[PDB]
Amino acid sequence: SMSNEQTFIAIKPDGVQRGLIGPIISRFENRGFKLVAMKLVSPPQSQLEQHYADLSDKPFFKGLVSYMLSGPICAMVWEGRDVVKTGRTILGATNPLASAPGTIRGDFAIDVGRNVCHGSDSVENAKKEIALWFKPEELISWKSATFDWVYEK
Amino acid sequence: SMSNEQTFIAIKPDGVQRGLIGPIISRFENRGFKLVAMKLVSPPQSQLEQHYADLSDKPFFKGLVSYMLSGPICAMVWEGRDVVKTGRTILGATNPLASAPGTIRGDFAIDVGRNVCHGSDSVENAKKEIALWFKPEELISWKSATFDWVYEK
Amino acid sequence: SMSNEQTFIAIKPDGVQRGLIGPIISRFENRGFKLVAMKLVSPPQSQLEQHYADLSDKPFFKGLVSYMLSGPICAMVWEGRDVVKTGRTILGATNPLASAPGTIRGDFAIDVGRNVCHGSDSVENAKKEIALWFKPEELISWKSATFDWVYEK
Amino acid sequence: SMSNEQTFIAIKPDGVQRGLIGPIISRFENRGFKLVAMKLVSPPQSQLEQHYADLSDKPFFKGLVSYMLSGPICAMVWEGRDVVKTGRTILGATNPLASAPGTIRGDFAIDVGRNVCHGSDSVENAKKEIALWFKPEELISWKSATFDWVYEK
Amino acid sequence: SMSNEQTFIAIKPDGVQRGLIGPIISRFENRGFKLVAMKLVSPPQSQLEQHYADLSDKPFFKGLVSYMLSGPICAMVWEGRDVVKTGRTILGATNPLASAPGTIRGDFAIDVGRNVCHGSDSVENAKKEIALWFKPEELISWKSATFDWVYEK
Amino acid sequence: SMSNEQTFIAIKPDGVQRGLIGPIISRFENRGFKLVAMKLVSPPQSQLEQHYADLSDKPFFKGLVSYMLSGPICAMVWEGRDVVKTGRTILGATNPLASAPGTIRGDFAIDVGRNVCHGSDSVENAKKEIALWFKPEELISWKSATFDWVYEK
Ligand SMILES: O=c1[nH]cnc2c1ncn2[C@@H]1O[C@H](COP(=O)(O)OP(=O)(O)O)[C@@H](O)[C@H]1O
Ligand SMILES: O=c1[nH]cnc2c1ncn2[C@@H]1O[C@H](COP(=O)(O)OP(=O)(O)O)[C@@H](O)[C@H]1O
Ligand SMILES: O=c1[nH]cnc2c1ncn2[C@@H]1O[C@H](COP(=O)(O)OP(=O)(O)O)[C@@H](O)[C@H]1O
Ligand SMILES: O=c1[nH]cnc2c1ncn2[C@@H]1O[C@H](COP(=O)(O)OP(=O)(O)O)[C@@H](O)[C@H]1O
Ligand SMILES: O=c1[nH]cnc2c1ncn2[C@@H]1O[C@H](COP(=O)(O)OP(=O)(O)O)[C@@H](O)[C@H]1O
Ligand SMILES: O=c1[nH]cnc2c1ncn2[C@@H]1O[C@H](COP(=O)(O)OP(=O)(O)O)[C@@H](O)[C@H]1O
Ligand SMILES: [Mg+2]
Ligand SMILES: [Mg+2]
Ligand SMILES: [Mg+2]
Ligand SMILES: [Mg+2]
Numbered sequence A, B, C, D, E, F: 001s002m003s004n005e006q007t008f009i010a011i012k013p014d015g016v017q018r019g020l021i022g023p024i025i026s027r028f029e030n031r032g033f034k035l036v037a038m039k040l041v042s043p044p045q046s047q048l049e050q051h052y053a054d055l056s057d058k059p060f061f062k063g064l065v066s067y068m069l070s071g072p073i074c075a076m077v078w079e080g081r082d083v084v085k086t087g088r089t090i091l092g093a094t095n096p097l098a099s100a101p102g103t104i105r106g107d108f109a110i111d112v113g114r115n116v117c118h119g120s121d122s123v124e125n126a127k128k129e130i131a132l133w134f135k136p137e138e139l140i141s142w143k144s145a146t147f148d149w150v151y152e153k
């Protein structure tokens, strides 16, 4: 696994409304992942329906899209070794009832329809979601001063 | 699972003595559950014996009742969807040696006889414990300003 | 100054609504003060008008009483040396615009009409407010295990 | 002082490198101010020279511009009553040696050339800095669920 | 079973460099374990090869020893019931990829070659490492003021 | 002015007993100062009377020395620009009654005889106390990975 793997993490409107932007960012920051893109956005319905295109037949699809439209979203790209899988572990189970304390949803969420955050489920879906939400010039290239202390190689 | 389920959470005398009232309250508060009743109490011996009536024949019963009388207790009623089961998850395993870091006992406790907190183990036992520790007038009815961001309509 | 001085600290309805019960309690807990009484209450208008009786001629009186009635209040009695004066310093300036970061209002509040918390301004007013909000049996007598490490005598 | 006043807050490259994005955001988030715009950026040299145009003749100007180009910047717009003046108070004194513990620089910074953050010093300079760093479409209009608990009607 | 059990916990050079001494000590402090010895040391290569003598044939041995020499180490001895096994649970899995959020490595580490901390894996090895890193005079004898609230003994 | 200035910071026995080692170290760690020496010690009465030799005629001298002997002490040396003066500002006023929230004593202490911590009051006295508490080999030489982000030098 390469240390330049990237994943798309988004703070959903309930996370923004409930004042969780700082804490959620700190979870990935303290773990050692690198923030390479971030923006507060209120994306159009078409973009949100494309983001959740695989769930278009689910009965909760229209309520999911309407709720994702109901407030601002903090869209982020994080970079690090196995950041996709480990990011999902940091977020916790999709349904917060099954999430463990110490994860984001295990500390902050209750309802699956209000699970505060989103994270890419696979490397290929991460590449697709990053391109959907961000322009290439919005990803910032930099090197952390503690890179050699987080990674062995 | 309705959003008005209630559970009884109590900070035991060792949790009060060790200065854990704030942190324990924050665990439930940050998760999104609603505090509907709270009071610091030094309840009578007969109340603690009735609270632990199911363990009256356990060899540690008299020691448990005497220790629960040795200091103040912060009794609380929390309200939320599946707050009984999720409350037990937040508290962690009864024996802290089996609890996971990130839970209350996994972060703060070591001995099973000093597990710093108590939580109702079922909805029916919650209703019993709420009626034992709180008069009905002590439960406050209110609507959280972020209720519609914690729960899906 | 005696180490058994007591003050009345209350988390106002905006503090409860905004999820600040845990953090505020931790401020007094970590400082070394002793919690001797606490209860979540929704007091009647008559009690709130008597609490603020000295402000009955102020133009903001009726709005203050209505806002104090609009949600639950976490009423507390804290005990410690100079807990009245030091408690006021922990809360910060009445108007949060003049409060310093590191105080409760300096960290959590903006408007003077929504300053999250209340604290007794003098020892004699503290004795009056404690008797107004609490029955004598609601004050719990106990001794902290770290009393001799917080106080020299 | 209306509740829709806006200020420009930016986490400088040293604050990003030292992993302070989360904690700094939480300072404003917990205080009750509304995040209306945010993005991670590596802006052009001419933008940073215009940002610090009032200091073009200071001897540290070229060093300041070069250091502000040495890493990513988290640019933010925060909205709230007196957010410009209170924002400066939260940040602390420009020289961290003169800053007080509890402020951002008083908690995290030492050197004036590495004071981890920037904040607009006046309302008119805030409007200038907002127009320089953000397109108008990047400011998101929304209503905080706890607005009526942060501000008096 | 015995509350006087001791284990060797070390903050590795990557943990010191990334400013994690405070948070790591707090994990064991808040849990209820007693610190009986601590020192910041830069031990010679011969001592580190003794410490990892059982891994002398591993292909990562040379890189491990070099990395352990690259910075200061915070050597500690913690005392408490089952502190060896529980200490390992607090640290998390050796490979942070497999660790859970809420543990030290689950909150702060990514690479197995940079897992921030070390903990004794057995009681016998703990006694061996304590004698290797500490002189017998460096272990301080004291009794915590909250010992009877942490343990039922 | 020089970034290699050093000061002696000690966590007094009341700070150790009340579980404040972690939080206190974090204050200096997060500020950007470098820990160059640390050890948990129980120094003899003769060393403590040397440390407080200028107060030998004070009426509280005997009680101070006895209290400093009543538990372990976490002796530390921190290095950074103006670390002596800024270190005193982080600790807060000698009498916690006069300290401000956000400082160590303003967050954790009440009595002047139990002020949790000690800090050198001048550079010359710092050099004297460092030589009194530490051997020259116990001061570790290293360079922080974020040194160039903390200092403009
Ligand atoms: O059963 C449901 N009812 C309401 N919302 C759901 C339900 N299942 C999933 N969701 C929402 O849709 C989002 C995406 O669902 P998905 O199946 O992709 O899980 P994921 O977010 O962990 O990748 C979830 O995060 C959740 O907010
Ligand atoms: O074996 C024991 N020795 C001493 N105390 C025990 C023991 N087992 C349980 N307890 C204490 O009795 C309390 C109630 O026991 P219970 O079986 O109901 O666990 P619970 O608190 O998770 O519901 C426990 O929280 C614990 O403090
Ligand atoms: O000018 C005002 N407009 C609206 N509310 C005010 C004003 N001044 C004071 N208050 C509110 O009344 C409460 C009590 O006022 P007081 O003068 O006693 O200050 P204090 O709360 O610090 O003791 C204040 O905390 C505040 O909530
Ligand atoms: O004397 C100096 N040497 C190096 N950098 C300085 C000096 N004075 C100010 N700066 C830097 O320039 C920035 C802008 O200067 P200004 O006077 O506007 O303070 P401000 O950031 O509080 O508004 C400061 O934040 C600081 O980073
Ligand atoms: O596969 C590896 N590659 C690089 N370093 C490793 C590897 N496996 C273990 N290590 C490092 O060696 C140290 C000691 O190895 P050990 O097998 O004893 O795990 P432990 O620290 O949990 O007891 C580990 O903490 C880790 O830093
Ligand atoms: O009046 C007093 N009564 C009891 N202890 C005192 C008193 N004044 C100072 N001390 C204690 O002696 C220690 C050293 O006194 P000093 O005057 O040097 O203050 P300092 O620690 O800020 O340098 C103080 O930290 C405090 O613990
Ligand atoms: Mg999906
Ligand atoms: Mg039971
Ligand atoms: Mg008044
Ligand atoms: Mg300026």
Ligand SMILES: [Mg+2]
Pocket: E121
């Ligand atoms: Mg091993």
Ligand SMILES: [Mg+2]
Pocket: F121
């Ligand atoms: Mg002195």
